[PDB]
Amino acid sequence: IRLYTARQVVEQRGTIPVDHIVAREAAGAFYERLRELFAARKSITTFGPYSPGQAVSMKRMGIEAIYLGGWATSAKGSSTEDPGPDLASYPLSQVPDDAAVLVRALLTADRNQHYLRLQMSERQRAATPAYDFRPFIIADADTGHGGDPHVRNLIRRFVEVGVPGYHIEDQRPGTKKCGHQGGKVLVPSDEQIKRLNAARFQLDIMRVPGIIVARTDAEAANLIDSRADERDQPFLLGATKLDVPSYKSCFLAMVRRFYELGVKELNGHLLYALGDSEYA
Amino acid sequence: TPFEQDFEKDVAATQRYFDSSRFAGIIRLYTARQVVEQRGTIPVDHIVAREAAGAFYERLRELFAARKSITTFGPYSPGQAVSMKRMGIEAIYLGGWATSAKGSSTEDPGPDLASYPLSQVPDDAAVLVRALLTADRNQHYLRLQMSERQRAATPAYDFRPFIIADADTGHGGDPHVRNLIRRFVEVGVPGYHIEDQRPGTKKCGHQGGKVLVPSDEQIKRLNAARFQLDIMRVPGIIVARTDAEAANLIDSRADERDQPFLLGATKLDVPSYKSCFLAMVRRFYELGVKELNGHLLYALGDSEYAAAGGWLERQGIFGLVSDAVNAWREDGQQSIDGIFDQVESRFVAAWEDDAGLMTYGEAVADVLEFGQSEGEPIGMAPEEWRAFAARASLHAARAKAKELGADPPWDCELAKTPEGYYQIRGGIPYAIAKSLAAAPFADILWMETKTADLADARQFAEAIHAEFPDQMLAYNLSPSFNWDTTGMTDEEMRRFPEELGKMGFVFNFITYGGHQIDGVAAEEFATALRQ
Amino acid sequence: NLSPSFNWDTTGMTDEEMRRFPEELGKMGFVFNFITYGGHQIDGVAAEEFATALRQDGMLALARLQRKMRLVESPYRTPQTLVGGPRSDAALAASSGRTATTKAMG
Amino acid sequence: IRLYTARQVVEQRGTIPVDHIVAREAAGAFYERLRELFAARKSITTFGPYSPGQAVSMKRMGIEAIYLGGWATSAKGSSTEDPGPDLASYPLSQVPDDAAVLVRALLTADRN
Amino acid sequence: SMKRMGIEAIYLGGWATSAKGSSTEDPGPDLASYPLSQVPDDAAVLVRALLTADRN
Ligand SMILES: [Mg+2]
Ligand SMILES: [Mg+2]
Ligand SMILES: [Mg+2]
Ligand SMILES: [Mg+2]
């Protein structure tokens, strides 16, 4: 389902022709291959390469496609980004920039392989394996790094450097926790679907049949940032004893007591303006 | 041990820094120890940002005390920035509007959606800082070749990087804010502004759909920024912007400080705004307008669709939908864009009218006024209730109203947008409330304004200064605000900047002025070359 | 190439000779002739002028700029349109299935 | 005169299709226009735009083509390059990076 | 990892920089034909990693 028309796509495209041929052709062949494997109940088993050489080696060893994730992108950093944990707090250009290196390595490996194969005899070619360096990549788009214009920008940046596949997850950006059992925060399904739909819109504009992967984090999620979506509402937890003061007010009253008893470092209650009656 | 001593020494130095007059009245939600444990052992120093921030802040304090101000604009090139300083403008603004318009080698230019990567404004600022430092090196080289008399005769320009740059909404949560501030500091920028909008919701050419975040979220952005600046030992200038003057929506009802401004329905048999909107779209679809399929974004139940349909029928909206589809057919089934927009406008007006939208404070006031008119004994005076409601959480307001035997029907859930955003009473009072909450977490406060109006500015400034008399302010001047259709005299326009300064607006800026003059210059030169 | 730093007024050329110079180049098969860093120069002059005007005449500096834009019907008079506001709004409508709220109540 | 053969070009290209459509189509039409002007003993008279807006404005005012020079690129600098004189001492990516901004502005102006 | 294992200093060469490429530079042989920013940009990543490891 697209929440827009063909006319709405065309009116974004202008008059000067563009063509994202690497992403377009890779996406076509990659999708067909995945459909083939699905029909046969077979699969590709891969890993995230950490260097262009790793990506090329994977294809030489027979692995048919490549994963690229934000965890490793965070760990690697860049000339302006300090390495760190998987918070998707890098600029939204970060994973596309990393993917661009992999695509260039793959296309370059293809050029170098072909150059050598042109110098071979027909029998030598039949005897010597030719590796498949097509850029079959699914890359991490995190939560889309904001709203629809962020999603579209991120997808655009992936497509421009030749990436045919992208994954978007139903988390709230900027809430990722390290080494905690709680505090994983979802967004409503309408917000997630609009990310997926925005991605499709951008791919359509660019004439790239890119592969959209929808990830859910609901298996271990604890929280959601809105109660508005009907599809989330069956999973909402509520109090049934309505004379119990709010969780929030109780938490803040507890912190304030620590503070008043002399633990000056616990001053987080000063973030809020809770009234006297509610504190009481 | 040496290890423990080294740590305790930096903690002590960091505490002295925290306690210095620079940060009088600022609340940090963390300790000196929490800063020091982030810093490692290998020394770093962001000397350009650190020294610029010190001198810039002192100058702003000086101007504030004298009720004077800097009036500046956003340079669109490094040359513009150097030129401004040569002409005697003391500081520089850098905004996201112009950054969006300019694009980059990988970013298409476009509208001000802050949808560029969060590196975008820092990268633009880096060019300006390098230009300023380079201008200083070149000026000094030439001045060293001069005689003493030549130096006394020839003006030396001040190329110090006194820049306040746009950090938008912080481009996410605390790690995004800290990353953005880090990137600014590393390239020498001493000042940053953060606004209380929800990222990814900016609208182009609409009177609605401006979406705020709760004050706790905004304050945490400001606090995260201070934390990063503290780690980096840069006394950077934090500017807290509020968009509440013209905001329509907020993405949460959870913060007590926003709750007095929430709008709720007072006629509770009206079906939800959301369900009515979706039922309207679904009717267009079912009547054969396949392009209006937005209702397929949601999974609304049959009972809710039916109730919303009942309302749309009764109010004549389904009549308007029928008329609209017939007109669409008569016109050859082209884009429904304009026809749909017109029906949507009528729908919104009809829903608002029937729902009886007001604040909870207004709803209770109506009940108390009625009691008074009926000659029932007053539990509290109208003005007394309004004063109470203005600073009360919804919980506290309801509890107090219940004591007074005023329990009016009021439901802010019914009035939520399809996205799930709450409607709020935007205006200068809301801007004041958000800004007062932010004041202990920021060095400068700014109420975003569309129109240049001294009375509006005064209302804001006087309200802030009643609680925080030492609070420096900043004022934006939109390049697209038509000055000539205000009817202001030439002299009123001349005096406007000075008038701002008198009210404690110390740093006032024509956001994308550079972009505008760049365009005019190019048009003129291209025309002249051709002719 | 036409150097921006070459002093045209000290050539002794008439105004009309300066007007005709580009056409004269074309007649000799110079098909593409260019003032190399013209943009840099006009950028500088524009900034000097505006900064001076702002310091001297406050917001009248902006009013005068706006007047010039109206006079020549520049697209800079509606900057939000110039940078693509309308097409971006249409992209939001497509991305959200026209469910994004743009109309106000109050 | 090319000092190489068609075979020498093809053996560099690999097997995975690429297409630089914007440069390819612009170069075709631009060259044809210059040949037309040359035949008519006419010319384009232009200047180096210092911003994307300047480039878009030039085209709006009817200038048919754009120059981009190293002098201005040196003067402008970048986030990592100090501005300075025309020494072509910037990294070789510098003028292409500046040109990329102009191309994006032009394509975007066309879309809008 | 090198520093964790006790190696006291680090080398960074153009051969490997050429082999790695970048978002705009195709990988290839050691011709030092990358922009002159290329090896500094690669070194910047290493310095940030080292300072970050120290902080952690
Ligand atoms: Mg991720
Ligand atoms: Mg303050
Ligand atoms: Mg040159
Ligand atoms: Mg070397």
Residue numbers in the entry:
A (entry chain C): 38 to 317
B (entry chain B): 12 to 542
C (entry chain D): 487 to 592
D (entry chain D): 38 to 149
E (entry chain A): 94 to 149
The authors write:
Isocitrate lyase (ICL) isoforms 1 and 2 are key enzymes in this process, through their roles in the glyoxylate and methylcitrate cycles. Each subunit comprises two distinct domains, with the N-terminal (residues 1–590) and the C-terminal (residues 603–766) domains connected by a flexible linker (residues 591–602). Enzymatic assays and molecular dynamics calculations reveal that ICL2 is activated by the binding of acetyl-CoA or propionyl-CoA. Our results provide strong evidence that ICL2 may act as a gate-keeping enzyme, allosterically regulating the glyoxylate shunt and the methylcitrate cycle, an essential mechanism during chronic infection when Mtb uses lipids as the primary carbon source.
We determined the crystal structure of ligand-free ICL2 from Mtb CDC1551 at 1.8 Å resolution. The 766-residue ICL2 monomer crystallised as a tetramer, with four subunits forming an elongated structure (length ~200 Å). However, the ICL2 N-terminal domain possesses an additional helical substructure that is not present in Mtb ICL1 (helices α10–α16; residues 278–427). The C-terminal domain of Mtb ICL2 is unique to this isoform, with no sequence homology to known proteins. The C-terminal domains from two monomers associate at each end of the ICL2 structure, forming a barrel-like structure. The association appears weak, as confirmed by small-angle X-ray scattering (SAXS), which gives an experimental scattering profile that can only be explained on the assumption that multiple conformations are present in solution. We assume that crystal packing has selected one of several accessible conformational states. The activity of Mtb ICL2 was measured by a nuclear magnetic resonance (NMR)-based assay that directly monitors reaction turnover 15 and a fluorescence-based continuous assay that relies on the reaction between glyoxylate and phenylhydrazine. Both assays gave comparable results; in agreement with previous studies, ICL2 showed poor isocitrate lyase activity using DL-Isocitrate as a substrate (kcat/KM 755 ± 70 M−1 s−1 at 27 °C). We then tested the methylisocitrate lyase activity of Mtb ICL2; no methylisocitrate lyase activity was detected with Mtb ICL2 alone.
